[PDB]
């Protein structure tokens, strides 16, 4: 869905929705940094280099903006508008103030001479403002859950190493270190992701039973 | 890496085959296969002798292995007892009527295959490679040679970084056919890898 290619080669960023069965169950353990040691394709001379990439896997979550407002959780005030209008502006409660109770957010509108023309506008703005307020909440939740998962730093931020010269891949968490990297690069991840699943499940017994 | 073998380049020019016999076509590939096995036991047993060249001749059926050594005594033994069991093991494996033969090497400091051994042996015994090249190139030069040069490749001194290391005096016109030169290889086995030893001895043109 997004893919910022870094000239040659990659992907300076790529994002994918992996749909299926047991996806977040198995692909959960990739959240963190991945170190690579190899002679880079970009190398002028013949020096071995260390690099890293960050992976975040957030599960596919449900999401639904509330059915607009519902007048039950709302206080509406009516009153006289301020400024021009003559006879009519003084004897006519044409100003609206709708107070959305669950958030305390308030709009007022004394734009037009019609009270419901203003209630309409004040219901329009209040809508956009509670939506925009929840979107932002849901934003800096997603945007800050990644900050942790993704692991800001690099070269030294966690998880596992892929050494091409020695052919070893190794997970630093379970301290597993099987050096059949060829297959792992071909997607044969299970001889890696299954050890973590068991070791993590041994931290579940010893957790409320130890 | 690109230089030719000095012997291979001077066949029939300043150098003769270390095996001299005819063979039609039907039996060449086992005359030789045996021939090769002959230098097998010979080099293996006569290390102590300092064997410089094996000249295998073949008459009617019968073999005729001549052998050149620095110190001949090792080969012969008390009352010539090793030299007999020698030609014994030979006909025991060849199945063909054999031939003992030994002529010594007059000046051991003029046979590259000898020099190479003595070098590679030294570094097998943790001797300073650099100052031992100049030593060998001295003796070979001081022993009358018209030219001399020794080369050592591999992890010198046990160093992680392998390297070439050589010295030379006099001439070594390797391009010149008219020149006679002696070549000599040796392999220094070590607790830290393997180092190749090469010798060049220029014994004047002709």
């Amino acid at each position: 869905m997004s893919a910022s290619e870094g000239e040659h080669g990659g992907y300076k960023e790529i994002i994918a929705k992996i749909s299926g069965d047991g996806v977040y169950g198995r692909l959960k353990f990739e959240s963190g940094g991945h170190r690579v040691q190899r002679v880079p394709a970009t190398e002028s001379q013949g020096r071995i280099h260390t690099s890293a990439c960050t992976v975040a896997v957030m599960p596919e979550l449900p999401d639904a903006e509330l059915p607009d407002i519902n007048p039950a959780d709302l206080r509406i005030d009516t009153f006289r508008s301020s400024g021009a209008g003559g006879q009519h502006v003084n004897t006519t409660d044409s100003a609206i103030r709708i107070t959305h109770l669950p958030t305390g957010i308030v709009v007022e509108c004394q734009d037009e001479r019609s009270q419901h023309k203003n209630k309409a506008k004040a219901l329009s703005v209040l809508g956009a403002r509670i939506h925009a307020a929840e979107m932002a909440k849901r934003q800096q939740a997603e945007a800050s859950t990644r900050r942790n998962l993704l692991g800001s730093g690099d070269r030294s931020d966690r998880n596992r190493t892929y050494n091409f010269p020695q052919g070893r891949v190794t997970d630093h968490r379970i301290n597993l270190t099987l050096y059949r990297l060829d297959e792992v690069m071909e997607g044969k991840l299970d001889m890696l992701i299954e050890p973590i699943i068991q070791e993590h499940q041994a931290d579940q017994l010893a957790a409320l039973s130890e | 890496g690109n230089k030719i073998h000095p012997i291979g380049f001077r066949l029939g020019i300043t150098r003769d085959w270390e095996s001299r016999w005819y063979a039609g076509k039907k039996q060449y590939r086992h005359l030789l296969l045996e021939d090769q096995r002959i230098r097998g036991l010979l080099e293996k047993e006569l290390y102590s002798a300092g064997l410089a060249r094996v000249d295998i001749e073949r008459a009617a059926d019968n073999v005729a292995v001549t052998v050149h050594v620095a110190k001949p005594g090792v080969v012969i033994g008390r009352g010539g007892e090793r030299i007999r069991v020698l030609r014994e093991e030979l006909a025991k494996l060849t199945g063909k009527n054999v031939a003992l033969n030994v002529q010594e090497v007059q000046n051991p400091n003029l046979s590259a295959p000898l020099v190479a051994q003595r070098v590679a042996e030294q570094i097998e015994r943790r001797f300073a490679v650099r100052r031992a090249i100049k030593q060998a190139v001295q003796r070979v030069m001081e022993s009358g040679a018209k030219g001399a040069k020794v080369i050592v490749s591999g992890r010198i001194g046990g160093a992680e970084q392998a390297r070439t290391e050589w010295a030379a005096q006099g001439r070594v016109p390797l391009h010149t056919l008219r020149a006679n030169i002696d070549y000599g290889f040796a392999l220094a086995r070590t607790t830290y890898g393997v180092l190749g030893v090469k010798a060049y001895i220029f014994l004047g043109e002709v």
Binding site: - | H5, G8, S19, W21, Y22, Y28, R29, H30, Q36, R39
Partner: protein, 60 residues
């Protein structure tokens, strides 16, 4: 697969077609000049060495 396979080569087979010629020195199966029973590399060395009778550096 090395010394075990050089041994299959020596064994008289089950069918004549399964014959293959190995090197009589290094043990290579591919590129095998039959005149010597040698491989193309073993050949080259001994040739330079002068331990192969009569054969010399060609030139014309």
């Amino acid at each position: 697969a090395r010394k075990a396979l050089i041994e299959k080569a020596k064994r008289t087979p089950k069918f004549k077609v399964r014959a293959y010629t190995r090197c009589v020195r290094c043990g290579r199966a591919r590129s095998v000049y039959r005149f010597f029973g040698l491989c193309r590399i073993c050949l080259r060395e001994l040739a330079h060495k002068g331990q192969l009778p009569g054969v010399r550096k060609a030139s014309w």
